[PDB]
């Protein structure tokens, strides 16, 4: 699926929050129009194309841009650069979670701007109230933002479902660090298993009743809340009170 709509392509490039001293890594470059717009704004673009024939034609198509390099390789086995950078990608359906993990694990990444299936982006950004476990776990380190829906008819060939632009931003200052962050991650893990039936019952496996009740109230969360509908700001408040 190749995005052809010029307005959406420009929206992606502007979403990436690029600047002249920041390099970009790109995956799923397709026709390379987006690559041109990224190269206009960033220090340089390194664009990954796994297919050797497509890599060669893309390299020639973009040879009028000296700050574009095309790498004939699988992006998923690429190492991130040891300097701040941004990722931009149009991600096929079957490797979306793996690309997200690639970005979450790159310690110098600033932003990751991705075109994904619509439902994937909504879950990972809580756009309709339901929250991914990974989003909650990484919220102290990353912002997850839903940018916009992208209608199927803007691609070629036209797919079956709609897409979306979503963005990760690595926070300049993490909301938690060190052992406190680990204690937060342990709390989130504990609650997403569902042991005991409800979030209150799960928390009671690790924390005293008096403190659990105080923490739920502090966070504005009911003892029987559906775990997936607790918001990240509520998880932080819950941990704040529990960790005293």
Numbering used by the authors: 42 to 285
Give verbatim lines from the article.
ErmE provides resistance to macrolide, lincosamide, and streptogramin B (MLS) antibiotics to S. erythraea. The bilobed structure of ErmE consists of an N-terminal Rossmann-like α/ß catalytic domain (residues 42–211) and C-terminal helical domain (residues 219–285), which are connected by a loop.
Here, we present the first crystal structure of rRNA methyltransferase ErmE, determined at 1.75-Å resolution. Only the truncated version of ErmE produced diffraction-quality crystals. The refined structure includes residues 42–285 of ErmE. SEC analysis and examination of the structure in PDBe PISA33 confirm that ErmE is a monomer. Superposition of the catalytic domains of ErmE and ErmC’ in complex with SAM suggests that SAM will bind similarly in the lower part of the pocket, with the methyl group directed towards the upper part of the pocket, where the substrate adenine will likely bind. Interestingly, the substitution of Asn101 in ErmC’ with Ala131 in ErmE suggests that the carboxyl group of SAM will only be coordinated through a hydrogen bond to the main chain N of Leu44, while in ErmC’ the same carboxyl in addition hydrogen bond to Asn101 Nδ2.
